[PDB]
Every structure is written in structure tokens, then in C-alpha cells.
Amino acid sequence: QEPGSGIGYPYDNNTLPYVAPGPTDSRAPCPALNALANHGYIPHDGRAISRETLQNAFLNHMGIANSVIELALTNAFVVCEYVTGSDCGDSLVNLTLLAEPHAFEHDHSFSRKDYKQGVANSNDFIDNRNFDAETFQTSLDVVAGKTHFDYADMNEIRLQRESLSNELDFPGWFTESKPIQNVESGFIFALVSDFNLPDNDENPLVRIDWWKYWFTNESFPYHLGWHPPSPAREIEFVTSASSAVLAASVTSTPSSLPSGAIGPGAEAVPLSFASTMTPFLLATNAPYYAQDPTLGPND
């Protein structure tokens, strides 16, 4: 928000306004990075981003401690080297390259289509990067009529998304990514679980309106009473939440789940790519921004 607005106070004492991305700006397949870039906490153009810039942006403006993004930074730069063909040092070339498929970006996302989702031909690919309202609605509908959801509900959401993706993706494309997705499940609990409930740290419940605002608008749900978690969330909270989602009892089993969908997941680890492997082409679509309504500087 505008720095004088005081909207972030006393949690964020140095806010910057929302500015929609323009057609030449680089955006990510990540709703967090996109929100940060829309506020200029990382470059508004989404280019040439250092680790420290990301660390400070997350810590000071989202209540996410450095520990939470350690592996994410490692993988961002692994993917940068893979996509660009050379070491990216400590300047991430852009956000868009993070949508390189079957890498850090993965199938069965909560709010993005898959790279080969619903394509008639094997060489076809689509926008697996920008927010997709229809896709996100398939996640939201699992918790329809609710204001909050818990670990078991999140497990049901990711199963629905796995089922849909496995059915809709071009044959042979779908690849399960439980470890990375469920770190992201933990990220959702970390950012938009309801800290106004007495047992939030032990038993976090996601506020659906907060989640929907963050994902749809790629800005922060301050108007809904959200604020950055304080103290900043740490990695322990995230991986615990991740394990709790995958441990939760499934009471509704979708059909067409991949092998081993139900049950614990492997620890997320550093990515690696063969030098022989050429990257998949990146979707080239202009960056998504909310248009129904468009957002003001304080939104």
C-alpha cells in the first residue's frame, strides 16, 4: 500500500503500493513472488533479482523468514542455470523462467494449468504460469460453503488437483510432484492460516477469503484483516504442515490418482538437470493481472 496509508502498520512499517504488471514485465508461476514484484519489493519488472533482495522482501513484507525460502532459492538458481545455459550467479535472470516445466514448476498446481493440459497434440503446450481462475475454482470448490479449512481439507484439494491433471494432461505428460507441491501447501498455511484463532500455531486453519484474495489479486489481503505473520514463519512450521497434510485421513478418494498418491511424501530436495537436457520452451504469455476489478495502489 501507499507508505503513508499505514495499512501495514505495525507489522510492515515501509509498504509500497500495488502496481499492475505491464506487458513487458516478467512474472512467475508463484503467487508470492508475483505479489512481491507487483509491490516493487523485488523488481517490478521481475528481472535481475538477488538472493538478498528475495530474503528481505519475504521477511520484511510477508512475515516469511529466511529459513522458509532456503531450498526455494537454491532451486530457483538451479533452474536459472538450466533454462539459460549458464550460471546465473546471484542475479536471477527473470521470474518467468521459473515456469520451466517438470522442474521447480510442476503439474497439478492449485491455480495454474499444466504445461500439456488438454492439448490435442503432443508438441503443444499452454500457459502453465499465469493465474487461471477456472483452475483455482477446482481447488476452491473442494471447500465450497466454508470460510476456513484444515490439513485434511488441503489433502483433499491436492488429490482433486492430481486427479484432474492426470485425466486432462496429454498422455505421458502428467508427473506427480508431492514433495514440492506440499511444501507449497505448508506455505499456504504459513501465510494465510487464521492467526486470530487461539491455537493457530498448533492447529492452523486457512482463511479461504485470504487465500482467494492473495491468489486472484497477487496482492495482500490487508482489507480482510490479514497482516504478515509475526514473528515471521520459519521452515519448521512449513514442513510440519506439509507432513500433516499428507498424513491426514482421506475420506473422499478421487478416481485416476497416480500410484502412491495417498500417503506420506518424500522430503523436497535440490533439483538437478543433465547438461544433455535442453529446456522445454517457456510459455510466452503476458503477465496476468486482476481485472475484475482492477486493483488500486492500496489493494
Ligand X SMILES: *[C@H]1O[C@H](CO)[C@@H](O)[C@H](O)[C@@H]1O
Ligand Y SMILES: *[C@H]1O[C@H](CO)[C@@H](O)[C@H](O)[C@@H]1O[C@H]1O[C@H](CO)[C@@H](O)[C@H](O)[C@@H]1O
Ligand Z SMILES: *[C@@H]1O[C@H](CO)[C@@H](O[C@@H]2O[C@H](CO)[C@@H](O[C@@H]3O[C@H](CO)[C@@H](O)[C@H](O)[C@@H]3O)[C@H](O)[C@H]2NC(C)=O)[C@H](O)[C@H]1NC(C)=O
Ligand U SMILES: *[C@@H]1O[C@H](CO)[C@@H](O[C@@H]2O[C@H](CO)[C@@H](O)[C@H](O)[C@H]2NC(C)=O)[C@H](O)[C@H]1NC(C)=O
Binding site residues, ligand U, CB under 6 A:
212-213, 216-217, 223-224, 290, 293, 295, 299
Q: Are strands 206-207 and 148-149 parallel, antiparallel or unpaired?
A: antiparallel
State the residue for C-alpha cell 523488481: 43
Give the DSSP H or E segment for 246.
helix 235-247
Q: Name which position in 33, 97, 98, 295 contacts ligand Z (CB under 6 A).
A: 97
Closest approach of Cβ 242 to ligand HEM, in Å? 12
Q: Which amino acid is at 199?
A: D
DSSP result, 18-55: --PPPTTS---S-HHHHHHHHTTSS-TT-EEE-HHHHH
C-alpha cell read off for 61: 513484507
CB 161 within 8 A of CB 110: yes
State the residue for C-alpha cell 533479482: 49
- Contact window for ligand X (CB under 6 A) among 5-13, 22-30, 33-41, 198-206: 198-206
The CA-atom distances, in angstroms, between 163 and each of 97, 141, 211, 259 are 26, 14, 22, 11
Closest approach of Cβ 132 to ligand Y, in Å? 13
80 among the known binding-site residues?
Answer: no
Closest approach of Cβ 251 to ligand Y, in Å? 40
**Binding of Mn ion by 109 (CB under 5 A):** yes
What residue 223 binds from ligand U, ligand Z, ligand HEM, none (CB within 5 to 8 A, per partner kind)? ligand U
Catalytic member of 100, 156, 162, 184: 184
C-alpha cell read off for 202: 498448533
Residue span 216-255 as binding mask against ligand HEM, x where in contact by CB under 6 A, dash where not: ----------------------------------------
Active-site residue flag, 184: yes
Q: How far apart are CA 154 and CA 95, in angstroms?
A: 27
Q: Which amino acid is at 135?
A: T
Number of residues that bind ligand HEM (CB under 6 A): 26
CA neighbor of 162 nearest in space, from 117, 124, 207: 117
What residue 295 binds from ligand Y, ligand HEM, ligand Z, none (CB within 5 to 8 A, per partner kind)? none
What residue 269 binds from ligand U, ligand Y, ligand Z, none (CB within 5 to 8 A, per partner kind)? none
105 among the known binding-site residues?
Answer: yes
Q: How far apart are CA 246 and CA 177, in angstroms?
A: 13
Catalog residues that contact ligand Z under the rule CB under 6 A.
Answer: 26, 83-84, 93-94, 96-97, 279, 281-282
Catalog residues that contact ligand HEM under the rule CB under 6 A.
Answer: 29-33, 54, 58, 64, 68-69, 72-73, 76, 98, 104-106, 109-112, 184, 187-188, 190-191
Tell me which residues are annotated as active site.
184
